[PDB]
Design a binder for this molecule. Structure first.
Ligand SMILES: CCCCCCCCCCCCCCCCCC(=O)OC[C@H](CO[C@@H]1O[C@H](CO[C@H]2O[C@H](CO)[C@H](O)[C@H](O)[C@H]2O)[C@H](O)[C@H](O)[C@H]1O)OC(=O)CCCCCCCCCCCCCCCCC
Ligand SMILES: CCCCCCCCCCCCCCCCCC(=O)OC[C@H](CO[C@@H]1O[C@H](CO[C@H]2O[C@H](CO)[C@H](O)[C@H](O)[C@H]2O)[C@H](O)[C@H](O)[C@H]1O)OC(=O)CCCCCCCCCCCCCCCCC
Ligand code: CLA
Ligand code: CLA
Ligand code: CLA
Ligand code: CLA
Ligand code: CLA
Ligand code: HEC
Ligand SMILES: CC1=C(/C=C/C(C)=C/C=C/C(C)=C/C=C/C=C(C)/C=C/C=C(C)/C=C/C2=C(C)CCCC2(C)C)C(C)(C)CCC1
Ligand SMILES: CC1=C(/C=C/C(C)=C/C=C/C(C)=C/C=C/C=C(C)/C=C/C=C(C)/C=C/C2=C(C)CCCC2(C)C)C(C)(C)CCC1
Ligand SMILES: CC1=C(/C=C/C(C)=C/C=C/C(C)=C/C=C/C=C(C)/C=C/C=C(C)/C=C/C2=C(C)CCCC2(C)C)C(C)(C)CCC1
Ligand code: OEX
Ligand SMILES: [Cl-]
Ligand SMILES: [Cl-]
Lengths: 137, 97, 30, 442, 334, 27, 33, 244, 37
């Protein structure tokens, strides 16, 4: 098995446009996800709120839907609760709150796409392990 | 006369849908727009006599009222089971991942 | 009955320690 | 008559070559301090907490008030560079004197000069060297005081508004406070001197110690040991070494507990949270999450009958529940705003938790000092992803190992010094075996 | 003739059947206190709330234990590292519920064993011996400090110290593996090498000396009677032992110097056990065994399990079950 | 790379011994 | 507790029979001189 | 003047309710036109009595004294709720929230441990009619709920539970289960207790009251494994009254 | 990172901390040279 363009093809938006990442983007995305996110989101879970994971089906049911590049890039700029009703930049890393989350300061727009693509690709590779937690280790 | 009431409850609509009187709050993530805001209101205002009673929760915006109507078919109500609602277990039932 | 047995054996071992130390065969040179 | 593997024992009575060994070794220590600082700076990224980066020396400099501002943010890396350069440069001077005295200088100093020469058995000369070094040590303790009071202050994790560099204007002088620490129990809730929790006590303790060391240095220059001390000790270089090994061992075990429990002179901003701190922060985190969802955290009974979020300590204080019940002695600047007279205050919990406290708890819970030897962060069952071992675990484990081995060395050299002093360190004289002239035991 | 100096002479007398000594002045009362409390608690102590969750664990014989299952149970997690002497309890009943005896026993024992080590130095000096037997005993002594004191200090509670019992010991080992992956820690691997190697070299040395006993007896008597206590001549032929062992392997893998040989015997297990004691003492601060969980993945990113991932599955089953009522939050951070 | 310097530095030490055991010095 | 009642006689003979064997042999050793 | 945490910590005082000056013999008047809350209700038990079992049924068992073994972990505090004025001038406190339970275990003669959930959960307690002033002779009487001492996730030592755990005795695979049913099937009791609060001190200036309470409730039944004991608790209380 | 003007030295600095280890190893090369005397 290998990292083909099929697996590297993810939804860009809610309208069905797709984008194919490079292997470079995917590995960059992985590295950046480890840099800025894995301390809470290792393996697609959320250590400080396990009810909410990074599984694609969970993200699909978020308001704004987050199961696509645009929704995820926006989330990294301006995070909301799962129902979209409240903005949570003061307690969740984002570019809006890079003053209080310094690791977000040196993230470029291209870095955001790479992180978002990693989150969308990894369940395609790992299946239930992504977001499933220790049961699947 | 010696029966496990939680097992018994799994044989009701509780085992099939979100029971507005018993189910832990994390289940409201299974449908869109319900968690955390409406979920918090639903649980605080239980118990309910009919699923339709949720629409009479004071303070619902009309957006919130519409989200509930969309999802009423995913809800049920059964009798309150003490074992499931004591201990604050509707907010945290000890299950994480 | 099982408690009595366990403590009895233990007590015999402690008594054996006493004899083994104070009533040992004395080591004697050459 | 020593073998090559005990070859440094051949220096015991070569004061000149032994001086070179000591001074050259001192160069190695200062060299590592400089080289390691520069290595840490070369790798330092300011946007990442220090404790995600494997740093142990930059935290020590930051703690003295150099390079940092409010909240522990790094504002200027130049002081770090300076510290490293000056140490590194200084190590060449020590290395130079060291190899000169070890290889080219007078092998013994007693002939070149009666002031620098010494005989281990000269109790007057030995206490005079001790006295000089005590004065040096006392001056060193007063330098810390000078820094804190006259040259910029120290980093104060307890400062209002997130921590900051603060000049210490009223150091604690009350000996009931200063020596009160020395008399507190080392057990939980007390913590002996490890519980020092404010910089006023830190600086005042160093005023006391500086004065005590200078006074004792003067005392030992001017006196010779009294008869009761003459008859209690072994007077030989190996004996003196053994005494110092015991002292270093003691100090290393203390240092171990300091870095594991104390978050005042090892600010968690730099070193990461303590084990207790991280455990408390987990309970805080889920209290916050659950309360936001509507849970009444004060009245929530957990599976055991004890509160799920809150319970009482054995003396009644309201404390976090779950296993962290063991850590309720923890005190930290992000948590104390919630504490009332009876412990955690339910009304503050319901009403006054601030976003910065939520952030700090989440940060500390996810940076608990647990990790694998290959630096995979978290509990032992965690998958690879996070590269992290807390600096507190690195500093605690290393210094436990060193302290243990120095206690072994104390025992080794103390036992040998006694046997050599009485003349049987090379074995039993076949013709005068003590046991053969004792009555049999039975 | 002075009372104090006669007392001093009896304390340090080499003529007492058991040597007392100044270390003995502390060792004897503290070991007797630990021993007497231990025996009584093991037989009759009521159940102890080890994990502080009002779930008492029965450790004594009269409360339904046998020798294998019985234990003196560690003190309550509610106490943590707090000092809990008897006079701090409102009653003995309270002290027993909360696990007081454990604290009394382990503190008296660790003090007494420390003095046991010093006592070994002390008599060696009175007898004109070399001094380092006590250094050999520092390896087991360090190991007892690790499981009774250092590990509780690091984890914040005497409730995570090793129980004083056979099955309690196994419980401590299993939990340790789930939380620290001790098997994958090099200091424990060195402990195994120290202990397996120590047993190996014990048998080797015993069998080589036994193989080369000089004929001094008949087939009808124990060969042990060929040696007489205090005889001056060696009782075996070390050159024959070396002649056999050097051919079993090759010449230069066999000792012909008995001093180097016996130093090696001393050093191998002592040093191995130092390391394993340091292993427990540093896992006390959560610097855990190697983690190779999901270290091998394929070209696509699938995890390819190794034996380390299988270990992990076992560790998880230990983790999720231990102290099954004691955790309310998702990470077991101590 | 970094392996260039650690080579120059790593050889400094044996270099000293070599020069001295060839110039029969006070080793 | 519901232990095997034969465990008592098993334990008693396991201790008694080997111990007596050794005592027999020791005492007849002593009386040889 | 009042104390700080570091004055209190470790003394036992954290488990004690505020006391009122023995001079506080006033009255706190009530205006049916205003609303009130209990801003803080504190209950500090001093005595745990457990009823014995007299073998027969013609002598009746007594309440006997017990020893606390769980230390200074017993007080209920920070309880709040509505203080309502009824048509007939009686007052009714309705508990809303607080640290309103503590597990306690006391030990009887002979060594039996008796765990109980000391609680006032869902307390509703009412005065006589025509109060109009809280005085040093005002009595509140009420009822509260006593949930099961362990909640539903609790696993017994063989892994059996209500909401989690095994449903059988797995170590006895072919044993007759009918005999094990009481231990195997867990159940969650919910019983009522009764409490009297007797006001003996009133600071009219500040709204604080204090006095004595007696409570009666059941002990732990270990999820239906055995029958509970009847427990009587006595202690002192303190409450602070506020206009809404 | 080091100040820009010393940037030239990053790869040397990455090696400096290890040098004290080399003094220990050098002690054994020296002893090998004189025959473990
Ligand atoms: C002369 C010869 C010497 C012989 C003298 C023997 C005297 C008795 C020794 C007592 C042994 C102590 C055991 C308990 C140690 C322990 O709980 O130590 C922990 C304490 C620190 O205590 C903690 O101290 C903490 C201080 O933190 C507080 O304050 C901090 C301020 O920033 C923070 O705010 C923190 O959140 C807050 O809690 C709290 O009080 C904790 O509750 C409390 O547990 O350390 C200490 O006192 C520091 C010293 C402990 C030494 C460790 C002994 C190790 C033994 C080595 C054995 C090897 C043997 C080899 C044999 C071969
Ligand atoms: C071999 C080497 C050479 C030779 C060496 C020499 C060897 C000598 C061997 C010595 C052997 C010692 C044996 C130790 C026994 C310890 C007994 C104990 O702890 O027993 C002592 C008794 C035990 O107390 C009872 O202990 C009980 C403990 O019960 C527990 O135990 C019971 C079992 O009986 C049940 O299981 C029960 O359910 C369970 O909870 C209760 O708590 C009672 O309330 C409590 O009174 O003490 C009391 O009650 C007495 C006074 C109570 C009066 C009440 C007022 C209090 C006054 C303060 C007392 C001052 C004490 C001074 C101490 C002086 C020390 C020198
Ligand atoms: C910090 C470690 C340390 C230090 C400082 C010393 C120091 C010393 N040792 Mg000990 N030794 C050590 C470790 C150490 N040893 C270890 C690990 C072992 C085990 C192998 C030994 C085994 C040992 C033996 C067997 C003996 C010593 C002896 C000596 C002394 C004389 C050595 C001599 O003339 O060599 C001559 C060596 C040379 C001429 C070779 C070059 C050595 C130089 C100093 C290298 C310096 C390099 C450096 C880059 C220079 C920077 C210069 C710059 C600052 C200007 C000297 C004081 C001897 C002694 O006691 O004499 C009576 C002796 O017999 N040592
Ligand atoms: C004595 C105190 C001490 C402490 C607590 C640390 C701690 C640390 N060092 Mg530092 N270091 C030290 C001494 C120390 N070092 C010395 C003496 C040197 C010179 C060789 C270095 C050189 C050094 C470098 C070059 C680097 C570190 C790095 C690190 C981090 C990761 C360590 C790791 O993965 O080890 C892995 C564990 C081992 C190798 C286990 C050793 C077990 C030994 C062999 C047993 C010995 C028993 C006896 C003593 C950690 C913060 C790394 C880092 O993150 O830098 C920012 C890094 O790159 N250190
Ligand atoms: C504690 C360490 C120490 C000790 C006890 C000695 C002792 C001695 N040395 Mg050695 N030496 C040392 C370190 C040491 N030296 C160092 C570090 C170097 C390298 C610079 C040398 C280089 C050296 C040489 C080249 C020679 C000696 C000689 C001597 C002898 C006479 C010294 C004299 O008359 O000076 C008298 C006093 C002074 C000159 C006053 C100096 C005041 C000092 C420098 C100020 C204090 C410095 C301070 C602590 C550092 C501040 C920190 C800074 C980094 C910011 C004496 C036996 C001589 C000898 O043995 O001849 C055969 C000789 O020729 N030494
Ligand atoms: C490195 C530090 C150092 C060293 C090695 C020495 C060494 C010595 N001193 Mg000096 N001394 C020092 C610092 C030092 N001193 C300082 C700073 C002062 C000023 C206060 C003094 C004041 C001083 C006086 C006044 C005297 C000495 C004497 C002596 C000699 C006997 C010491 C002795 O028997 O101790 C062994 C200690 C004891 C027998 C008593 C133990 C007391 C402690 C506090 C018990 C605590 C033990 C506990 C387990 C540890 C925890 C600490 C606790 C307080 C919390 C010896 C040469 C004596 C001498 O001959 O003078 C010429 C003497 O009379 N010293
Ligand atoms: C201030 C500290 C100090 C000082 C000055 C001394 C000084 C001395 N010791 Mg003592 N020693 C110490 C601490 C100290 N020791 C400690 C802490 C211990 C316990 C571990 C001992 C145990 C000890 C023993 C057992 C003996 C001495 C002996 C000696 C004498 C000769 C030593 C020699 O030539 O070594 C030469 C150096 C070597 C042979 C090198 C040893 C290399 C070590 C063991 C490995 C280090 C590797 C390190 C952990 C990192 C590796 C990581 C990775 C690469 C794998 C000398 C007087 C001897 C003696 O009694 O003489 C009187 C002796 O037999 N020492
Ligand atoms: C802890 C300090 C976190 C870090 C670091 C990061 N995330 Fe996070 N995330 C965290 C929490 C507590 C939550 C829940 C927020 C809520 O209350 O709803 C989240 C949520 C997300 C989500 C949404 C998941 C979903 O809707 O199913 C996403 C997509 C997410 N977080 C992404 C994300 C990224 C990309 C991060 C690195 C830049 C990152 N998080 C860090 C906690 C934390
Ligand atoms: C005796 C002896 C010994 C020992 C020795 C020793 C120990 C030595 C030491 C020595 C030393 C201790 C040395 C040091 C040196 C140093 C130096 C020489 C330095 C330099 C510096 C520099 C040049 C710098 C530079 C820089 C800067 C300035 C800035 C930044 C960058 C850089 C870093 C580049 C032995 C064992 C071997 C053997 C036997 C004998
Ligand atoms: C700084 C500081 C401080 C202070 C401190 C101090 C002040 C200290 C002191 C300390 C001290 C003050 C110490 C002491 C010590 C001592 C010891 C350690 C001793 C020991 C001893 C010994 C060892 C002995 C022995 C012996 C005997 C017993 C007998 C005879 C013989 C001999 C001699 C051997 C504080 C905390 C506030 C804070 C922070 C900082
Ligand atoms: C004088 C002297 C001496 C001697 C000493 C001695 C001999 C001592 C002893 C001591 C002792 C002999 C001790 C004892 C101790 C004990 C203890 C301290 C105990 C405790 C116990 C307990 C407390 C118990 C409890 C319990 C339990 C656990 C269970 C059941 C119940 C009861 C309650 C009973 C000598 C020779 C050294 C020399 C010097 C002088
Ligand atoms: O107590 Mn005994 O064991 Ca050491 O982690 Mn946490 O805590 Mn408990 O859990 Mn896993
Ligand atoms: Cl367990
Ligand atoms: Cl927990």
């Amino acid at each position: 098995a290998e990292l083909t363009p099929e697996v590297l093809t993810v939804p860009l938006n809610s309208e069905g446009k797709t984008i194919t990442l490079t292997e470079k983007q995917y590995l960059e995305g992985k590295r950046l996800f480890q840099y800025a996110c894995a301390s809470c989101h290792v393996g697609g879970i959320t250590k400080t709120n396990p009810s909410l994971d990074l599984r694609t089906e969970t993200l699909a049911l978020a308001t704004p839907p987050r199961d696509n590049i645009e929704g995820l890039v926006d989330y990294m700029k301006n995070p909301t609760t799962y129902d979209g009703e409240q903005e949570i930049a003061e307690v969740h890393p984002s570019l809006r709150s890079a003053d209080i989350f310094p690791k977000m300061r040196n993230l470029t727009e291209k870095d955001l796409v790479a992180i978002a693509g990693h989150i969308l690709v990894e369940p395609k590779i790992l299946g239930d392990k992504w977001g499933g937690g220790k049961v699947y280790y | 006369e010696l029966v496990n009431v939680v097992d018994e409850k799994l044989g009701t609509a509780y085992g099939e849908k979100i029971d507005l009187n018993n189910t832990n709050i994390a289940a409201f993530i299974q449908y869109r727009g319900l968690y955390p805001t409406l979920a918090k209101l639903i649980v605080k205002n239980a118990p309910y006599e009919s699923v339709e009673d949720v629409l009479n929760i004071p303070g619902l915006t009309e957006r919130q009222k519409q989200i509930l109507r969309e999802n009423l078919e995913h809800f049920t109500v059964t009798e309150v089971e003490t074992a499931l609602v004591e201990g604050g277990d509707r907010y945290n039932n000890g299950l994480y991942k | 009955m099982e408690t009595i047995t366990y403590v009895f054996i233990f007590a015999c071992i402690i008594a054996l320690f006493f004899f083994a130390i104070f009533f040992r065969e004395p080591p004697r040179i050459t | 008559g020593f073998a090559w593997w005990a070859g440094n024992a051949r220096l015991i009575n070569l004061s000149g070559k032994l001086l070179g060994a000591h001074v050259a070794h001192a160069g190695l220590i200062v060299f590592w301090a400089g080289a390691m600082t520069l290595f840490e700076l070369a790798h330092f990224i300011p946007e990442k907490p220090m404790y995600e980066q494997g740093l142990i020396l930059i935290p020590h400099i930051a703690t003295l008030g150099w390079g940092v501002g409010p909240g522990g943010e790094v504002v200027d890396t130049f002081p770090f560079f300076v510290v490293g350069v000056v140490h590194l440069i200084s190590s060449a001077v020590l290395g130079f004197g060291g190899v000169y005295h070890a290889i080219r200088g007078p092998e013994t100093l007693e002939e070149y000069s009666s002031f620098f020469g010494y005989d281990w058995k000269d109790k007057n000369k030995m206490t005079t060297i001790l006295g000089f070094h005590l004065i040096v040590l006392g001056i060193g303790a007063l330098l810390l005081v000078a820094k804190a009071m006259f040259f910029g202050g120290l980093y104060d994790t307890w400062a209002p508004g997130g921590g900051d560099v603060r000049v210490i204007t009223n150091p604690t002088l009350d000996p009931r406070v200063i020596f009160g620490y020395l008399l507190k129990s080392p057990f939980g809730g007390e913590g002996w001197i490890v519980s020092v929790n404010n910089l006023e006590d830190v600086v005042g303790g160093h005023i006391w110690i500086g004065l005590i060391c200078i006074a004792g240095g003067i005392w030992h220059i001017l006196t010779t040991p009294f008869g009761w001390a003459r008859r209690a000790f072994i007077w030989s270089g190996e004996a003196y070494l053994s005494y110092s090994l015991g002292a270093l061992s003691m100090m290393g075990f203390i240092a171990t507990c300091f870095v594991w429990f104390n978050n005042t002179v090892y600010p968690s901003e730099f070193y990461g949270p303590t084990g207790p701190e991280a455990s408390q922060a987990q309970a805080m985190t889920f209290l916050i999450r659950d309360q936001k969802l509507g849970a009444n955290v004060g009245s929530a009974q957990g599976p055991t009958g004890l509160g799920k979020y809150l319970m009482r300590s054995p003396t009644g204080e309201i404390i976090f529940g779950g296993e962290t019940m063991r850590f309720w002695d923890f005190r930290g600047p992000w948590l104390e705003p919630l504490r009332g007279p009876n412990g955690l205050d339910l009304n503050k919990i319901k009403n006054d938790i601030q976003p910065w406290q939520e952030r700090r708890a989440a940060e500390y819970m996810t940076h608990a000092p647990l990790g694998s030897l290959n630096s995979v962060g978290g509990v032992a069952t965690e998958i690879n992803s996070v590269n992290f071992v807390s600096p507190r675990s690195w500093l605690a484990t290393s210094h436990f190992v060193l302290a243990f081995f120095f206690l072994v060395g104390h025992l080794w050299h103390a036992g040998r010094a006694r046997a050599a002093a009485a003349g049987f360190e090379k074995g039993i004289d076949r013709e005068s075996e003590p046991v053969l002239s004792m009555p049999s035991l039975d | 003739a002075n009372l104090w100096e006669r007392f001093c002479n009896w304390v340090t007398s080499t003529d007492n059947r058991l040597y007392v000594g100044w270390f003995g002045v502390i060792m004897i009362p503290t070991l007797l206190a630990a021993t007497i409390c231990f025996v009584i608690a093991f037989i009759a102590a009521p159940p102890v709330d080890i994990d502080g969750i009002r779930e008492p664990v029965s450790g004594s014989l009269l409360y339904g234990n046998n020798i294998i299952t019985g234990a003196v149970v560690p003190s309550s997690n509610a106490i943590g590292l707090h000092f809990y002497p008897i006079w701090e309890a409102a009653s003995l009943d309270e002290w027993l519920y909360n696990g007081g005896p454990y604290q009394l026993i382990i503190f008296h024992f660790l003090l007494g064993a420390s003095c046991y080590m010093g006592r070994q130095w002390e008599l060696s000096y009175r007898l004109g011996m070399r001094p380092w037997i006590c250094v050999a005993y520092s390896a087991p002594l360090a190991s007892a400090f690790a499981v009774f004191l250092i590990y509780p200090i690091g984890q914040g509670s005497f409730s995570d110290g090793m129980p004083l019992g056979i099955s309690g010991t196994f419980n401590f080992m299993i939990v340790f593996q789930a939380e620290h992956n001790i098997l994958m820690h090099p200091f424990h691997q060195l402990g195994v090498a120290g202990v397996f190697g120590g047993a190996l070299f014990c048998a080797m040395h015993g069998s080589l000396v036994t193989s080369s006993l000089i004929r001094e007896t008949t087939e009808t008597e124990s060969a042990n009677y060929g040696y007489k206590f205090g005889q001056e001549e060696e009782t075996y032929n070390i050159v024959a032992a070396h002649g056999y062992f050097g051919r079993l392997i090759f010449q230069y893998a066999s000792f012909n110097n008995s001093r180097s040989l016996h130093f090696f015997l001393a050093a191998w297990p002592v040093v191995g056990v130092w390391f394993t004691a340091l292993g427990i003492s540093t896992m006390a601060f959560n610097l855990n065994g190697f983690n190779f969980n999901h270290s091998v993945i394929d070209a696509k990113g699938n995890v390819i399990n190794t034996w380390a991932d299988i270990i992990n599955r076992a560790n998880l089953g230990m983790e999720v079950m231990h102290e099954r009522n004691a955790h309310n939050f998702p990470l077991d951070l101590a | 790379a970094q392996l260039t310097m650690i080579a120059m530095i790593g050889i400094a030490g044996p270099m000293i011994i070599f020069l001295l055991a060839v110039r029969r010095g006070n080793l | 507790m519901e232990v095997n009642q034969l465990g008592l006689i098993a334990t008693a003979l396991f201790v008694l029979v080997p111990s007596v064997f050794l005592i027999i042999l020791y005492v007849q050793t002593e009386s040889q001189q | 003047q009042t104390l700080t945490y570091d004055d209190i910590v470790g003394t036992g005082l954290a488990n004690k309710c505020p006391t009122l000056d023995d001079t506080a013999r006033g009255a706190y008047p009530i205006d049916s036109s205003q609303t009130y809350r209990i801003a803080r209700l504190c209950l500090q038990p001093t005595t745990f009595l457990v009823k014995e079992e007299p073998k027969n049924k013609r002598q009746e068992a007594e309440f006997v004294p017990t020893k606390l073994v769980t230390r200074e972990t017993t007080s209920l505090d920070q309880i709040q709720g509505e203080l309502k004025v009824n048509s007939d001038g009686s007052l009714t406190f309705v508990e809303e929230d607080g640290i309103d339970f503590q597990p306690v275990t006391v030990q009887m003669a002979g060594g039996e441990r008796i765990p109980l959930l000391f609680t006032v959960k869902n307390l509703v307690a009412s005065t006589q009619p025509n109060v109009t002033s809280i005085t040093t002779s005002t009595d509140f009487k009420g009822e509260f709920n006593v949930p099961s001492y362990r909640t539903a996730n609790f696993l017994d030592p063989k892994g059996r539970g209500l909401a989690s755990g095994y449903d059988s005795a797995i170590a006895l695979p072919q044993a007759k289960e009918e005999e094990l049913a009481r231990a195997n099937v867990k159940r969650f009791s919910l019983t009522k207790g009764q409490i009297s609060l007797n006001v003996a001190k009133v600071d009219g200036r500040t709204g604080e009251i204090a006095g004595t309470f007696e409570s009666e409730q059941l002990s732990d039944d270990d999820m239906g494994a055995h029958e509970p004991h009847e427990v009587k608790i006595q202690g002192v209380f303190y409450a602070s009254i506020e206009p809404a | 990172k080091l100040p820009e003007a010393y940037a030239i030295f990053d790869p040397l600095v990455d090696v400096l901390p290890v040098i004290p280890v080399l003094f220990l190893a050098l002690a054994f090369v020296w002893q090998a040279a004189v025959g473990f005397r």
